[PDB]
């Protein structure tokens, strides 16, 4: 009754704190340091591989640590593992359920983890002894579809539900070792840090949240957009990470003075991103649209410069390789091109 | 280069072998139709299954393989996962049209079905579920449709009705009602891409899997036409 | 951050008017189709009217047709919701929706349990 009211009117007071000590930390805009640098010029990247071999809309891609297999899932229960410089298809995964919203590529390459609306995480053994692709285990904890999913190890990946949780599994028992609470929200995409000791995570409820993978618990809150987070990407020096929502905008969030950097919006564009990943430098900031097409941001002017095309459905998913080769987005009319 | 030459070989061979299967895969594939079915907790929509957080039926009627799938793990929100399914044949929305407390939500639900960015090419199979509840509340008395309809006061039976011979005419202007609610919002927004095709549905009905049947084969062959410029 | 918090009333009598105002701010009000949803005690909660960006396609539910007015004010990023002819079953708390993505018009998932953007709300109690 009244300590709900009196808890509440404390809450509103710290959160006017946190807002005052984050608007005195405001000293210039990054645009305002960023006026003095040459932009970056027209990038103009083309088709190099054109991989098809899907039934139904791909939903998400993942590149290996080679920077040269990716795996691929789509709506018709195929997982896919392709290799981008001869766009032969090494294997092809007959899921179990269709219904696969994520896909993950274990950093090794050992392993490949997939799970959509049937709320786990098989994990799939690629380099049996006997030669074939077997599933390995099924995370079976969440409930809710599975949005996301990121290998850790061998042994350690990490999971984003539509429950507003996100779980840090242990694929060897196969039971969540860690448990993140605190997204009002579906939770839609996840990004590990460089060196995964911690990570960063993005829910419907137009807010991002950064986890410390040890001690499970949220350390900063992140809330600037207006509509719900439907990609996140950490900047290459997992210092900052940059959230696309629906409300077509993406924007650059920095862990350590706790604000928003860049908004990275236009007046013509008016749908939503799919997708967001940046490039090996942490210049260029891809970001998939619903207009069907990719773009290109200069991330640190905020100036478009470049744009993707070439594709007949909405840009799904977007991933940059790990060595800063090509870039492969795949797209709801079943075709994955790569570009560079 | 012998051990590269066979590096490639080897690899070639496996492409293939896998293309073999996937085109095994893809024939079987675009031969079964996928129908999104989707109503409320009181609905119905259980037992129209005849056969986790997906429940797979499928069934067969007149040869073709269709595949339907209620989707129930999930929690309350349906804003990202329902995208999944802008590639179904139809999608069944089923409807108690008993309960009228709860029938502007399943309006509401409709109205943003039908106007979804990529549910905005999807036809829905409408089935009107309870026809014998509403036919026993409506006769009762105790429960008046325009006190959650203030409209129903001013509707007449339409004149292409079918009341099913046997019946009164309150039960068919309290069904028609309904059913025209919800059509009304159907054709205020849908441009031809997508159709409403309302049933009025008993839950002993064992005729209703060729009204799917009967519904997708239209919807399909209305879409034939369409991208024939021949409509 | 996106933040809606209503300012109506409390108790009034069969028969009353009251005048509900939210206050929606931390987004482009412009952009948006708001929202009234209510919760009657012990009951689920049921939306009442909406709105679309301008001010020009109303819509209502049944029960509120004809005693409630639900107009917006772009220009000072609020909502209003005029009530006439208030009755015993409109005790209700009334929370002040809007949609989840903007230049929309389906407003999808807004009567949910727990639902983002969306006020405390405010408890009209009709009583004597």
């Known amino acids: 009754q009244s300590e709900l009211d009196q808890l509440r009117q404390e809450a509103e007071q710290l959160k006017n704190q946190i807002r005052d000590a984050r608007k005195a930390c405001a000293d210039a805009t990054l645009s305002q340091i960023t006026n003095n640098i040459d932009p970056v010029g027209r990038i103009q990247m083309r088709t190099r591989r054109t991989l098809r071999g899907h039934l139904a809309k791909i939903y998400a891609m993942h590149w290996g640590t080679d920077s040269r297999l990716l795996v691929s899932a789509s709506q018709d229960g195929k997982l896919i593992i392709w290799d981008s410089y001869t766009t032969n298809k090494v294997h092809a995964i007959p899921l179990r359920s269709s219904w696969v919203m994520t896909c993950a590529y274990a950093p090794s390459g050992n392993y490949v983890a997939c799970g959509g609306l049937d709320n786990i995480c098989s994990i799939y053994n690629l380099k049996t002894r006997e030669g074939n692709v077997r599933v390995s285990r099924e995370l079976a904890g969440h409930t809710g579809y599975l949005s996301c999913c990121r290998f850790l190890d061998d042994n350690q990946i990490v999971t984003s539900s539509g429950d507003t949780t996100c779980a840090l599994w242990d694929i060897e028992t196969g039971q969540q070792t860690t448990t993140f609470t605190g997204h009002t929200g579906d939770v839609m995409s996840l990004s590990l840090a460089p060196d995964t000791r911690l990570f960063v995570s993005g829910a419907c409820d137009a807010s991002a949240k950064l986890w410390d993978v040890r001690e499970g618990m949220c350390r900063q809150t992140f809330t600037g957009h207006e509509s719900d987070i439907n990609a996140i990407c950490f900047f290459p020096n997992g210092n900052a990470f940059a959230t696309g929502s629906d409300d077509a905008t993406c924007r650059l969030f920095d862990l350590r003075a706790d604000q928003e950097l860049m908004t990275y919006s236009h007046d013509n564009i008016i749908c939503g991103i799919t997708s967001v990943s940046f490039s090996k430098s942490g210049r260029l900031l891809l970001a998939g649209y619903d207009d069907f097409n990719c773009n290109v941001w200069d991330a640190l002017k905020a100036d478009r410069a470049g744009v993707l095309a070439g594709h007949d459905n909405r840009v799904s998913c977007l991933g940059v390789t790990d060595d800063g080769m090509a870039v492969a987005t795949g797209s709801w009319d079943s075709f994955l091109k790569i570009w560079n | 280069t012998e051990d590269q030459r066979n590096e490639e070989k080897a690899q070639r061979e496996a492409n293939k072998k896998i293309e073999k299967q996937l085109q095994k895969d893809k024939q079987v594939y675009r031969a079964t139709h996928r129908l999104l079915l989707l109503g409320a907790d009181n609905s119905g929509k259980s037992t129209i299954v005849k056969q986790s957080g997906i429940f797979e039926t499928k069934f067969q009627v007149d040869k073709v393989n269709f595949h339907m799938f209620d989707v129930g793990g999930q929690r309350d929100e349906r804003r990202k996962w329902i995208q999944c399914f802008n590639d179904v044949t139809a999608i069944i929305f089923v409807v108690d049209s008993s309960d009228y407390n709860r029938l502007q939500e399943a309006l509401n639900l409709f109205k943003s079905i039908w106007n979804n960015r990529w549910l905005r090419t999807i036809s829905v199979i409408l089935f009107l579920n309870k026809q014998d509840l509403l036919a026993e509340k409506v006769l009762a008395g105790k429960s008046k449709i325009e006190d959650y309809f203030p409209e129903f006061a001013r509707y007449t039976t339409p004149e292409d009705a079918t009341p099913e011979p046997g019946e009164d005419p309150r039960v068919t202007r309290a069904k028609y009602f309904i059913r025209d609610e919800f059509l009304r919002i159907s054709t205020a927004s849908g441009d031809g891409r997508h159709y409403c095709y309302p049933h009025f549905t008993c839950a002993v009905d064992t005729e209703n899997a060729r009204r799917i049947f009967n519904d997708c084969r239209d919807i399909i062959q209305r879409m034939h036409l369409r991208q024939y410029e021949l409509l | 951050q996106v933040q809606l918090q209503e300012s109506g009333g409390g108790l009034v009598q069969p028969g009353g008017s009251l005048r509900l105002s939210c206050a929606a701010s931390?987004?482009?009000?412009?952009?948006?189709?708001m929202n009234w949803v209510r919760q009657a005690p012990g009951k689920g909660l049921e939306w009442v009217s909406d709105?679309?960006?301008?001010?020009?396609?109303?819509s209502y539910t049944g029960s509120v047709k004809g005693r409630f007015t639900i107009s917006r004010d772009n220009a000072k990023n609020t909502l209003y919701l005029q009530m006439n002819s208030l009755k015993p079953e409109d005790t209700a708390v009334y929370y002040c929706?809007?949609?989840?993505?903007?230049?929309?018009?389906?407003?999808?998932?807004?009567?949910?349990?727990?639902?983002?953007?969306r006020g405390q709300g405010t408890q009209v109690t009709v009583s004597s």
């Open positions: 709105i679309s960006q301008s001010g020009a396609s109303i």
């Open positions: 929706a809007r949609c989840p993505a903007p230049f929309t018009r389906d407003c999808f998932d807004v009567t949910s349990t727990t639902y983002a953007y």
């Open positions: 931390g987004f482009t009000f412009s952009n948006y189709k």
